[PDB]
Amino acid sequence: VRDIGLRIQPPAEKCDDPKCPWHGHLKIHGRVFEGIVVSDKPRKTVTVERQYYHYLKKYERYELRRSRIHAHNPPCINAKVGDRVLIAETRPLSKTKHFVVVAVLERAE
């Protein structure tokens, strides 16, 4: 079984395109995040959301924050809305796609 430098398990199918890190000619290098999908309307792209807490200092309380990014969605792991995904960083793929989906966790619920 092939690894790419993440110590995780590959997908159970084979792809076509060359913009896939598992089966093609793409290289991943950088940050490694984790979120849940909020749309996949256009072709081969998703939108992933993650949440964190900001700590104000004058009032000493917390505050909820978000971050929405866009990721390439190779045809061997095509992710729908409402499921956890691991995403990695690589070169610019379009005007606003700079990440790629590598593994899907918890499909349905």
Partner RNA sequence: GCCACCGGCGGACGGCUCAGUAACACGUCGGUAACCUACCCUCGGGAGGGGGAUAACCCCGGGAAACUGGGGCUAAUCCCCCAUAGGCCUGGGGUACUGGAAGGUCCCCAGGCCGAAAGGGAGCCGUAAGGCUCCGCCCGAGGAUGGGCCGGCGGCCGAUUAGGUAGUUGGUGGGGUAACGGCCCACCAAGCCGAAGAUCGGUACGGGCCGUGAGAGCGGGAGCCCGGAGAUGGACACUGAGACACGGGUCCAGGCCCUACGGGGCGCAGCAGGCGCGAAACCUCCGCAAUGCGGGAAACCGCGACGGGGGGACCCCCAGU
Taking CB under 7 A as the rule, does residue 9 contact RNA? no
Picked from RNA, Zn ion, none, the partner binding residue 76 (CB below 5 to 8 A depending on kind) is: Zn ion
Instruction: Examine residue 82 and tell whether it contacts RNA (CB under 7 A).
Output: no
> What minimum distance in Å lies between the beta carbon of 106 and RNA?
21
Residues whose CB falls within 8 Å of the CB of residue 30, separated by 6 or more in sequence, listed in order: 88, 89, 90
Q: Please select the residue that binds RNA; options are 69, 76, 86, 104, rule is CB under 7 A.
A: 69
Q: Cβ(73)–Cβ(46) under 8 Å?
A: yes
Does 36 contact RNA by CB under 7 A? no
Range list of β-strands (E), the chain = 32-39, 45-55, 62-72, 84-89, 99-105
3 binds, among RNA, Zn ion, none (CB under 5 to 8 A by kind): RNA
Which candidate, 45, 36, 15, places its Cα nearest to that of 86? 36
Binding residue count for RNA, defined by CB under 7 A: 42
Which ranges in the chain belong to alpha helices (H)? none
Binding residues for RNA, per CB under 7 A? 3-6, 17-19, 25-31, 39, 41-45, 47, 54, 57-58, 64-70, 72, 89-98
